[PDB]
Amino acid sequence: LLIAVFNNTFFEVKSISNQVWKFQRYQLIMTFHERPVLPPPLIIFSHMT
Amino acid sequence: MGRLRMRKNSGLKVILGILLPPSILSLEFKNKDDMPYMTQALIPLGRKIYEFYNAPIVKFWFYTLAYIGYLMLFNYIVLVKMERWPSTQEWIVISYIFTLGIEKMREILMSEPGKLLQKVKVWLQEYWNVTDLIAILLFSVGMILRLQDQPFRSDGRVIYCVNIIYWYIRLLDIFGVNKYLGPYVMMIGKMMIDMMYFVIIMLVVLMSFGVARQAILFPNEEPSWKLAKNIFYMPYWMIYGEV
Amino acid sequence: MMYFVIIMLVVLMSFGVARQAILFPNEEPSWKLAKNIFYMPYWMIYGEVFADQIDPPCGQNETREDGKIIQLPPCKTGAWIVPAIMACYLLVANILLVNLLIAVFNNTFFEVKSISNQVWKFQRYQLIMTFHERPVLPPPLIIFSHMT
Ligand SMILES: CC(C)CCC[C@@H](C)[C@H]1CC[C@H]2[C@@H]3CC=C4C[C@@H](OC(=O)CCC(=O)O)CC[C@]4(C)[C@H]3CC[C@]12C
Ligand SMILES: CC(C)CCC[C@@H](C)[C@H]1CC[C@H]2[C@@H]3CC=C4C[C@@H](OC(=O)CCC(=O)O)CC[C@]4(C)[C@H]3CC[C@]12C
Ligand SMILES: CC(C)CCC[C@@H](C)[C@H]1CC[C@H]2[C@@H]3CC=C4C[C@@H](OC(=O)CCC(=O)O)CC[C@]4(C)[C@H]3CC[C@]12C
Ligand SMILES: CC(C)CCC[C@@H](C)[C@H]1CC[C@H]2[C@@H]3CC=C4C[C@@H](OC(=O)CCC(=O)O)CC[C@]4(C)[C@H]3CC[C@]12C
Ligand SMILES: CC(C)CCC[C@@H](C)[C@H]1CC[C@H]2[C@@H]3CC=C4C[C@@H](OC(=O)CCC(=O)O)CC[C@]4(C)[C@H]3CC[C@]12C
Ligand SMILES: CC(C)CCC[C@@H](C)[C@H]1CC[C@H]2[C@@H]3CC=C4C[C@@H](OC(=O)CCC(=O)O)CC[C@]4(C)[C@H]3CC[C@]12C
Ligand SMILES: CC(C)CCC[C@@H](C)[C@H]1CC[C@H]2[C@@H]3CC=C4C[C@@H](OC(=O)CCC(=O)O)CC[C@]4(C)[C@H]3CC[C@]12C
Ligand SMILES: CC(C)CCC[C@@H](C)[C@H]1CC[C@H]2[C@@H]3CC=C4C[C@@H](OC(=O)CCC(=O)O)CC[C@]4(C)[C@H]3CC[C@]12C
Ligand SMILES: CC(C)CCC[C@@H](C)[C@H]1CC[C@H]2[C@@H]3CC=C4C[C@@H](OC(=O)CCC(=O)O)CC[C@]4(C)[C@H]3CC[C@]12C
């Protein structure tokens, strides 16, 4: 029955998930644009900068 | 892509640019005024280096490589035994946790509202930020317990293992960038609700059988918490091919 | 299946590393740790939970088969977490990634079936011309046609 409810709701969830991912591409891009260049293990230098 | 032409076999070129700095200058950069997206409005070599290292794709891959190296190190410090004092790899991991916490604090401070409680609320509206704060606090308490003597060191190791569970689950954040893996991950998150309702019905049927079996096969039993364990133990593994 | 294997690899390595790092505290650097990461969690997907090693009785005294009093090794710290995270791992893996792979196999079946039938009908020509251009004699006897 879990197989059945997974199968019969697959298409709507797949379309909504693809569209929500395409929407959240902007959030990912602006977040990574606002982050510092230096990685988390070396971000103390950019933080003191 | 930032100020970079590329758009052909993505990912690999910026990975070789990151690992090999003399691979950066061999790439076709975009013009000075082709599409200048800005926030507030030897020299060519330095300009190319600055344009490469400020691109969001380069920053993403360089974050991803740092996270992968950190996860490999935290594997090395949980698998191998640890002495009274942390090793170099454990110090690098502790530094990673402390700097990631400082980064999340800076993200809290540099947000939209004025009042600090509003900033805290709009930052905790994301679930991944809440789990990040929880995991950083757990790493802090585990490391505090680990820097003491026995038996607190083993408790700190246990908390380290639970944290490694969390950081593997957080590797899906990096997987969220790929065009096929990200929709797959949030698709899984959608089917979790149906799984929960399934778990509710399984819990009812499982507890019925387990209570019946334990109360029939063991008539003379004292009040002990092992009965509750025996309710759940064998019926749960009977679902996965072990009768 | 590859995307499914990627997600299974993440969850499998998480559980295996947690189990190995909890149940074996004092370990030297050896490649057997990496093997123990993958060994038992992978066979747990296919109906073998290794029921003797879920939660063995330890930290008590239990009589052996001959009746002699045998002292079990003491409890490892946090050893009770291994069955709980094993329960979570078995639930997530066997119930969610297998059924989700069933779902993505089912809902993409028709388009793939039509494209596969049409591509096979297209490649019939490639098969026919290839077998028309091959020699008569089989590969074990093709040296005669080759010297011909
Ligand atoms: C950018 C991403 C994709 C990869 C970056 C990670 C690796 C470069 C790191 C992660 C884990 C590291 C290993 C973790 C632990 C050790 C044990 C270490 O040996 C000791 O600590 C004991 C002997 C000594 O003191 O040298 C030698 C380095 C090594 C193999 C490290 C080598 C470098 C590794 C593979
Ligand atoms: C930025 C992070 C998240 C990943 C970057 C990868 C490398 C820069 C790191 C990962 C593992 C590190 C290694 C882990 C352990 C050791 C053993 C260490 O040996 C000693 O210190 C022995 C002498 C002593 O006991 O003090 C020397 C550094 C080294 C090779 C480290 C060098 C730097 C490595 C390769
Ligand atoms: C070793 C054992 C303990 C395995 C660990 C099991 C769980 C702690 C993991 C396994 C799979 C994980 C899930 C995989 C995918 C997602 C989607 C992802 O959520 C989103 O991307 C948000 C959008 C959405 O939920 O649709 C992160 C949460 C969630 C439910 C994860 C929650 C934590 C889960 C259940
Ligand atoms: C309906 C389904 C989806 C969920 C219901 C199953 C779980 C709620 C059960 C199944 C196995 C149970 C575990 C089986 C064994 C143990 C070990 C037990 O610790 C001990 O027995 C101490 C060590 C020892 O005495 O050997 C603590 C409870 C726990 C984690 C149990 C917690 C509850 C679990 C995870
Ligand atoms: C609707 C569903 C969720 C009902 C499920 C009920 C059971 C799972 C619970 C309800 C009452 C519980 C009992 C309440 C009290 C005790 C006494 C307790 O005894 C002790 O802790 C020893 C006392 C001491 O020496 O201090 C052992 C667990 C036990 C049997 C509990 C076992 C689990 C029980 C049966
Ligand atoms: C409601 C759904 C969605 C989630 C499932 C929740 C419960 C089914 C779980 C969560 C916490 C679990 C409890 C956590 C800890 C224990 C103590 C544990 O005690 C021992 O094992 C005593 C040690 C021994 O005598 O060996 C017995 C199982 C029990 C009651 C667990 C029974 C199953 C519980 C209630
Ligand atoms: C996520 C899923 C789809 C894939 C992940 C599982 C595999 C990558 C794992 C599971 C079982 C593993 C194998 C289990 C045992 C061995 C034997 C081992 O060789 C020995 O131990 C030497 C002989 C001996 O000492 O007995 C070498 C690694 C290998 C092949 C392992 C390689 C990696 C395997 C195939
Ligand atoms: C993001 C995912 C893919 C991370 C997975 C990481 C682990 C599977 C790797 C990363 C670093 C590896 C370790 C790096 C170095 C060593 C030392 C190595 O020691 C020796 O070979 C003995 C040295 C000698 O005597 O020559 C044994 C394997 C081990 C523990 C490795 C085991 C597997 C580890 C933990
Ligand atoms: C990425 C997906 C699509 C494919 C899966 C790839 C990896 C999960 C596999 C491929 C090669 C495997 C490795 C091949 C060989 C070994 C050596 C093996 O070493 C031993 O067994 C040592 C002998 C012993 O001590 O018994 C341990 C597992 C390991 C690291 C394997 C771990 C799993 C790996 C990394």
> What is the makeup of the main sheet of chain A?
none
Q: What is the 3D shape of chain A?
A: elongated
Helix content of chain A: over 70%
Q: What count of helical segments of chain A does DSSP give?
A: 3
The SS-based structural class of chain A is mainly alpha
The rounded distance between the terminal residues' Cα atoms of chain A is 57 Å
Considering residues with a beta carbon less than 8 A from a beta carbon on another chain, report the largest interface and each chain's count: B-C, 37 and 39 residues
PDB class: membrane protein
Keywords: trpm3, ion channel, membrane protein
Entry title: Cryo-EM structure of rabbit TRPM3 in apo activated state at 18 degrees Celsius
Chains A, B, C: rabbit TRPM3
Q: Topology, please?
A:
The structure is cut from a larger assembly and holds three copies of chain A.
Chain A: H1 2-8, H2 10-34, H3 43-48
Bound molecules: cholesterol hemisuccinate (Y01) (9 copies).
In short:
The structure is cut from a larger assembly and holds three copies of chain A. In chain A, 78% of the residues lie in helices and 0% in strands.
Description of the molecule:
The structure is cut from a larger assembly and holds three copies of chain A. Chain A is an all-alpha fold and 49 residues long. The first copy, chain A, has three helices and no strands. The termini of chain A are far apart. Chains in contact: A-B, A-C, B-C. The complex binds cholesterol hemisuccinate (9 copies). One cholesterol hemisuccinate binds next to helix 3 and helix 4 of chain B.
